[PDB]
Design goal:
The complex is a heterotetramer, with two copies of chain A and two copies of chain B. Chain A is mainly α. Chain A has helices spanning 3-12, 26-30, 34-65, 69-97, 100-112, 114-128, 135-152, 154-164, 170-198, 203-232, 238-255, 269-273. Chain B is 44% helix and 11% strand. Bound molecules: adenosine-5'-triphosphate (ATP) (2 copies), thymidine-5'-triphosphate, magnesium ion (MG) (2 copies) and manganese (II) ion (4 copies). Chains A, C: Keywords: Deoxyribonucleotide synthesis, Iron, Metal-binding, Oxidoreductase.
């Protein structure tokens, strides 16, 4: 009942980072403190890693196991967006704002950062555990994918949105909003596929799947807290970002058909502000009136 | 999102099944309560403001020095006494984003609407305080609007030229081509749109110094001009805009047209160079009879006859060209060429169409020259003489290059004030002043023709707005009756003002004695046909205003015979792109494209309803695409019969209609006397 | 040396089925004979069936085994074009020209057809034989992929191009030309990835891989000749189609860095009408002599 | 296939393991007994031939009218008395395909080699029968070869200009840019290669009258010039060739270089305009020390100091530019810029490299101006003053735009005849005549510089041919000793002829008094150092000829001080591309690219062995790519020490070597005093 409308929405949302000129951010970037620039680079690098694996591994593997040519076409399109559009856009931002050495250093930093490695290990592990014709392993990977789309990106998205909302780094911010618009529909779509599998189960099996989903969310959440503190303490925003990731965790649960898990909190209003023609021959009668 | 933008977007939100048009007014208030007043620089008195603007190189000292400070203060007080309020948010937004003077840092507003109007009036009057107050009352009543160059730049030291329509004749030589490129660059630097006639240039495969197959044709010249216009782009502010016109009997006409095809290669297609095609009546006759036509090599014709192909009447010269063995020509199918024109206009809106004989059968200055091409907006139609730019240390033969002076009457505001005569005469005086104060030191033929011809273009706008707010359909015969009467009065008072200026200054335009004004032929249709309204509704619209009769036209003809006419050309209807927003008017005499237009500024959306749009006149504000293009052609021809120059006439087509329909509209325009066709905008 | 350049060319060639209006083809379709309509339907179904294998298996399997983030992104983009753009385009052409029952019957026929099946299963067999971390098996699959993209499609493309060059079925011919333009670049790109593997091999292993490629080409070519006669004899075109197959076989070989196998031949004019030195840093003391 | 084509292809068919070089001779015989003699047009006598060529607008009658027909007959008889035979098929083929005069339809041959030489000699002599015979003997012996423009066009009615290269200075203004485009088109129409110095143009992101970030930089002017050269392409016969030169300290230097990158976008890529980079010693010093350099905005420097950035010495003003806050600059890595230059030269052979300090440390006319750029072949290095092209109706300040006439000595034929002095003096006289009869009516600065500077270029060809045919390795120290002695003799006799012309005409070149010729500084190294051969073999090679000593140089210095010099510049070694074929000579002073070159003409292929190639001198004809580029740099520096202008020095590189090797070669060239580097041709 939904794939065709998602197909149409995904293809109509198609974009490339080159559509957005980035040289306009040069001055507001220059004006940020060293702490702010550091957090910003690292935040986008963490996002780049997530999209790299979502494009290389997550979306293609889910596409392989989901039945139906139209469902596969949507998932293939989403996969392309992840690595050919989203992951690449971050390099466009980096290449504009930062010198090569700072770019090299931040990519080295992703490799050695323990929270980023842990979250990649956990998510990709679940993708690679999918067994052919085994719907339960597929469900588990789809939960992981929804958590990546609708929860894990948000510790990263906070900062570009926070600046966009203050009228700073607005070209980079425009790119990020386009990425976010895509991930929102990706999270909903994968969520609907996960619910399909969940709804086939006995009540006993469903109870276990909810346990899996909640245990996984809590494990990812605890790691994300440490990641958030590590990045945001130097810019004074860790508590604010934490509220934002809890907000989005609830959206991820809802995408999976589950009740919200965290209590509602006031999000920084700045971040909320951050959101050929047919041819006929001429007759002799067309020359007279 | 700012408060005024929310109030503007609340228009589309329907209450009781109706658009909240009145909310737009509230938006304006917000746009002034929250933004404009906060970012407007205020001074203790006008003396301090004028001193700050003059000292900081914002204004010019010369035009302000012609008045005492008391007179300038009185003019400003007259401007502010109207208490003018922008009726829509987009009017104020467009003025304060495009025309209001801002500081060098572009964060503060130095000029209000009244300040800009007062400065333009003081510039117009050239030292006459009463004339300046008359101009202030004209512009604050929004009866007359100087063009974007004049309105934006009048009285400003950091400014471009007040003229932005330039027509250049290019002679068939490398020296002339290089000079044309240079002049195009210099005029684009001044901020003007440049149109070049390429018909005199010899086609591809012609001889240079008696070596065969040497000429690159007009397409290489178009590539050079396109590069020149890309380079000269108003100091990196606007994209350099240029137009190239070629006669349809030029052999390069296909390659010319091929420059606008999407499939054209990078060495063929020109992207920033608009193209227009001049279509003589002979081509239309050949297409009508399905006889195969001939496209001629211009240099062979020049060698055989001593004159350029576009300098002689093709109606009487075509058979002689065809029968002449020394004239080289190529066989073409005129109907295929017409279909190609229609297809290209469907794809990209190009080329502009100039019906040469439609222009020249009513041209008053055929003795000086026949109108061979039009401007970038395809509404300037004037006599031009090519210049012979010789080698270095050799005297050039300077010809006439067209550069007319733009200004538009607001038909709604003019007619509701019952001031057709006063507005037309004051606009003519302002256009004469701007033409006299224009001095271009890098375009010799443009300067010479400005000094000699003294040609101005007085246009009109808000025709569809006025008709819709008066319960008249744009396609109705009553609308055409009103256009006929209104533009006949405009022509009458423009001719009267031109003759009065000629009598006062004791001089006419150069070669006026050979014009149809001097011989009285121009007034023939005016001394025999009565142009009073034939409908009671239109007559009641014209109530309170004297409508010139045949006796009045005879008196005007005698006055012109006795005193002459100061302007070679007076009236031309320009598109009026952005000034129509500030004046809260529909663009030009064209019908409206949309009832409410959606625009994206920055990352915000904005909504502009057409002026005076409401539930009662929603049906009368018919969109242009929904209209019958034949009736639009009829209205434009009705207006054109009273306009000496052309009218920027854009075709509005649906995606359903084919190239046959476009060709039919073009042929009906040719039949009805339409001089130029501007664009083919497909919905 | 090449992936970013191909990325650019791929993304700038992006298109959607909806851009070409198909209904005006019915004005020439109605004037074709039964044999012409039959051949067209069968050719179209052949292309559709082969392209589906490439979208579901060929491109995604190669993307899975190739190392490199940028290569995976380009390959993902190509897989997207197969599934989201090409497959929808073929379906659109069919739905325009034939009623539902006729489409189902043609696909039933072509699905059972011996020559179509032989080539489809030969290609799919090589994709299924790729082994993790075995570059030889990957190379063999890449050869199969290049043969599909740059060679096997062309016995089919011939007919739409033949009509397109005559002014018949212009809307569907425009679509086919866009598809063909994508397959050409796909073939060139996968060819470069195969040459990279080939160049890492010993001389004996190279000779062995050349023998594999030529042997595979021979098997496919002999089946193409039979496929060609089966479809085109009824419309009298087989001789010219055979020239077109050999010409495209030579292009496929050149994509794999191999010499042409067949002598140069001229192609049907109607179908024709349708159609760095090593950077070494200055080490100082290079300024002193 | 033609019989001569088969005979020429028989060279590569080895007999007894050796090439059949003698077969080449047979080919020429065939080429004459089957094609040339049949396709030639014979007349009853010379009178009918001259009359037919004069009335049919083949020859100018003015230069022939200065001689009685008896004198012309005597000159032609002197030309034909030598019984000149082309020793190779390609020599005759190249002459009769590129330089022999043909009919209007190009079906027959009107000019033989002797006829062409006689006509050129009669044009050179300007009415002197004995001088015409001297020129005939000089050219029929092939001791001297006028450049392709002069040799091809002398005495022809349908001729172009005799000047090969033109160098234009472009001032930083729209008027100057447009004038430069016009002059470039005019000179490409005349057939000459045009070089433009873009270093005065302000960089991208500069202010045009107080509006900032407005300029398009040198890349926009580059695109304009590229389109101009594409349009003016010698009437479609030879592709229009232009050169742009930019100082390496210009801010646009990267974008400049990005015009030649193979990955450049179409809006930046320039394909018909060669690029050259002018590198002062300051840039090399900064790269050597690895200190980050600064590229500068020319307009800020001009505003602060009143002079252009390239108008003053960067070696003394770079620190002042850097420490000046009113000067705008960008940080660059000079070593990275050098590596980019090497990579660009490896990929496409561009840019040309001009070591400005190497040019100006021995430049004799630094008082007039420093040499800021080179020509399209990077061998013309002369003082130029920029022109101030003002607005229309305003007088232009005409500067000096470089232009010199090319002529090459055939080293093998000159030394075989033991006539260095006579050949040099006669070539100087011929080049002086070519300069005197050159009058360009559309390039004012070029005309003024030709009239004032009187600069000529006397080159040399067949250096490698002479060395290989005499058993001397081109890289050997003996070859460099020969080059030193021979070019010191050439410089001595060129200076002597220039001083003699100045004495006989009573006039020197403009501003000669401030030159190093007038002060005697130029002769310093010539009055203290002896340039006689240091090897016995070279001294024997120079036997029968008086090698000037320090005493002869002192006498010449005194003679110059007493009488002055007629020519500001005398010697420049052009590439001599296609005219080297006719002379049976190796191209310029460069080493041969290949021993036997396979060239495809029509559907046939021909093999041209190097002149004098045989079994005994096969390894003396070492290919340039196999040679050490450092020893070639040593040879070029040895020649350059005696050449006042530059030498077109092409680098011949192997594919194996890296960009670091290219950078090392460039830095060694700069260290050794190489003025310019032409091309990086990779095998
Ligand atoms: N629609 C409008 N168009 C133009 N200016 C406006 C508009 N609305 C407000 N302004 C500006 O804001 C000022 C405040 O106008 P407001 O509607 O508050 O009342 P007012 O009686 O006109 O005020 P004031 O004492 O300023 O004359 C106006 O004087 C004018 O300068
Ligand atoms: N290599 C060559 N270079 C120039 N001209 C040549 C050459 N070979 C032949 N010719 C021309 O063709 C003619 C053919 O004559 P050829 O050289 O065979 O000897 P010939 O008849 O004995 O007379 P001669 O050698 O005295 O001219 C020559 O007279 C000359 O005009
Ligand atoms: C007009 C124009 C100039 N330029 C650049 C190229 C010229 O080298 C440079 C100088 O132009 P100028 O012709 O000297 O402009 P100007 O004299 O009015 O301004 P200024 O007083 O500052 O000299 O500006 C552009 O890049 N684009 C343009 O459209
Ligand atoms: Mg001429
Ligand atoms: Mg200037
Ligand atoms: Mn993503
Ligand atoms: Mn996603
Ligand atoms: Mn496909
Ligand atoms: Mn494919």
């Amino acid at each position: 009942d939904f794939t065709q409308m998602f197909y149409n929405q995904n293809v109509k949302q198609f974009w490339l980072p080159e559509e957005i000129a980035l040289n306009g951010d040069l001055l507001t970037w220059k004006y940020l403190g060293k702490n702010e620039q550091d957090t910003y680079m690292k935040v986008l690098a963490g996002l780049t890693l997530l999209d790299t694996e979502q494009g290389n591994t997550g979306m293609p593997i889910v596409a392989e196991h989901v039945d139906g040519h139209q469902r596969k076409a949507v998932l293939n399109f989403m996969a392309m967006m992840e690595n050919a559009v989203h992951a690449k856009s971050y390099s466009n931002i980096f290449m504009t704002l930062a010198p090569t050495e700072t770019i090299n250093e931040v990519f080295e930093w992703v490799k050695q950062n323990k929270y980023l490695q842990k979250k990649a290990q956990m998510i990709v592990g679940l993708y690679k555990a999918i067994q052919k014709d085994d719907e339960i392993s597929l469900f588990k990977a789809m939960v992981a994918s929804v958590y990546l789309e609708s929860f894990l990106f948000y510790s990263g998205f906070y900062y570009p949105l926070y600046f966009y909302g203050q009228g700073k780094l607005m070209q980079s911010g425009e790119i990020i909003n386009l990425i976010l618009r895509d991930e929102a529909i990706h999270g909903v779509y994968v969520g609907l596929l996960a619910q399909e599998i969940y709804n086939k189960q006995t009540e006993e099996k469903k109870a276990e799947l909810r346990e899996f989903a909640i245990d996984l969310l809590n494990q990812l959440y605890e790691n994300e807290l440490e990641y958030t503190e590590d990045l945001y303490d130097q810019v004074g925003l860790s508590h604010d970002v934490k509220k934002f990731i809890r907000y989005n965790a609830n959206k991820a649960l809802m995408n999976l058909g589950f009740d919200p898990y965290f209590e509602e909190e006031d999000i920084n209003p700045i971040v909320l502000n951050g959101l050929k023609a047919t041819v006929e021959p001429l007759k002799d009668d067309d020359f007279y009136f | 999102v700012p408060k005024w933008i929310q109030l503007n977007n609340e228009i589309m939100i329907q209450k009781d099944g109706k658009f909240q048009f009145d909310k737009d007014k509230e938006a304006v208030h917000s746009y002034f309560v929250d933004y404009i007043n906060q970012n407007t620089v205020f001074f203790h008195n006008l003396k301090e403001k004028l001193d700050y603007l003059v000292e900081n190189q914002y204004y010019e000292e010369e035009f302000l020095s012609l008045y005492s400070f008391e007179d300038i203060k009185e003019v400003f007080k007259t401007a502010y006494a109207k208490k003018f309020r922008f009726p829509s948010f987009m009017s104020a937004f467009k003025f304060y984003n495009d025309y209001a003077l801002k500081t060098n840092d572009k964060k503060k507003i130095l000029e209000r609407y009244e300040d800009r109007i007062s400065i333009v009036a003081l510039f117009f009057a050239n030292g006459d305080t009463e004339k300046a107050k008359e101009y202030v009352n004209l512009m604050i009543n929004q009866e007359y609007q100087p063009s974007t160059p004049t309105f934006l730049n009048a009285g400003r030291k950091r400014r471009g030229e007040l003229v932005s329509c330039f027509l250049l004749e290019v002679n068939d030589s490398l020296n002339d081509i290089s000079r044309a490129i240079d002049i195009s660059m210099q005029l684009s630097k001044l901020g003007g749109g440049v149109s070049l006639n390429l018909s005199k240039l010899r086609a591809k495969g012609e001889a240079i110094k008696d070596v065969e197959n040497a000429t690159k044709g007009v397409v290489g010249v178009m590539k050079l001009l396109d590069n020149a216009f890309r380079y000269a782009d108003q100091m990196g502010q606007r994209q350099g805009s240029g137009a190239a016109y070629l006669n349809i009997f030029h052999r390069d006409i296909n390659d010319f047209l091929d420059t606008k095809k999407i499939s054209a290669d990078e060495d063929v297609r020109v992207k920033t160079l608009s193209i227009g095609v001049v279509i003589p009546d002979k081509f239309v006759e050949l297409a009508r009879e399905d006889k195969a036509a001939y496209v001629f090599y211009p240099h062979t014709i020049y060698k055989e006859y001593g004159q350029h192909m576009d300098e002689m009447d093709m109606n009487e010269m075509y058979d002689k060209f065809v029968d002449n063995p020394r004239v080289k020509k190529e066989k073409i199918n005129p109907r295929k060429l017409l279909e190609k024109l229609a297809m290209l206009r469907s794809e990209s809106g190009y080329p502009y169409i100039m019906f040469q004989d439609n222009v020249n059968k009513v041209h008053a200055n055929n003795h000086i020259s026949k109108v061979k091409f039009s401007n970038l907006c395809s509404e300037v139609l004037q006599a031009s003489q090519v210049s012979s730019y010789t080698d270095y240390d050799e005297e050039d033969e300077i010809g006439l290059d067209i550069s007319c002076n733009l200004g538009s009457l607001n038909i709604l505001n003019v007619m509701e004030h019952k001031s057709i005569e006063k507005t037309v005469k004051l606009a003519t005086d302002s256009l004469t002043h701007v033409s006299e104060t224009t001095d271009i030191r890098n375009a010799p033929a443009v300067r010479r023709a400005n000094k000699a011809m003294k040609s101005i273009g007085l246009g009109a706008m808000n025709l569809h707005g006025y008709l819709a707010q008066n319960g008249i359909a744009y396609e109705s015969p009553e609308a055409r009756d009103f256009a006929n009467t209104f533009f006949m009065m405009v022509n009458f008072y423009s001719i009267q003002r031109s003759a009065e200026i000629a009598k006062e200054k004791g001089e006419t335009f150069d070669q006026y004695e050979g014009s149809t004004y001097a011989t009285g032929e121009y007034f023939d249709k005016y001394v025999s046909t009565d142009f009073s309204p034939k409908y009671e509704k239109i007559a009641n619209l014209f109530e309170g205003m004297h409508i010139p009769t045949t006796e009045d036209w005879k008196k005007l003809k005698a006055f012109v015979a006795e005193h002459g006419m100061y302007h070679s050309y007076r009236l031309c209807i320009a598109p009026t792109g952005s000034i129509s927003y500030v004046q809260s008017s529909t663009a030009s005499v064209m019908p409206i494209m949309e009832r409410i237009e959606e625009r994206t500024y920055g990352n915000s959306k904005t909504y502009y309803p057409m002026p005076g749009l409401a539930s009662n006149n929603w049906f009368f504000y018919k969109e242009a695409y929904d209209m019958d293009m034949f009736k639009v052609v009829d209205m434009i021809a009705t207006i054109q019969q009273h306009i000496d120059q052309g009218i920027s006439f854009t075709l509005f087509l649906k995606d359903t209609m084919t190239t046959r329909d476009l060709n039919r509209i073009d042929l009906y325009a040719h039949h009805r006397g339409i001089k130029t066709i501007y664009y083919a905008r497909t919905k």
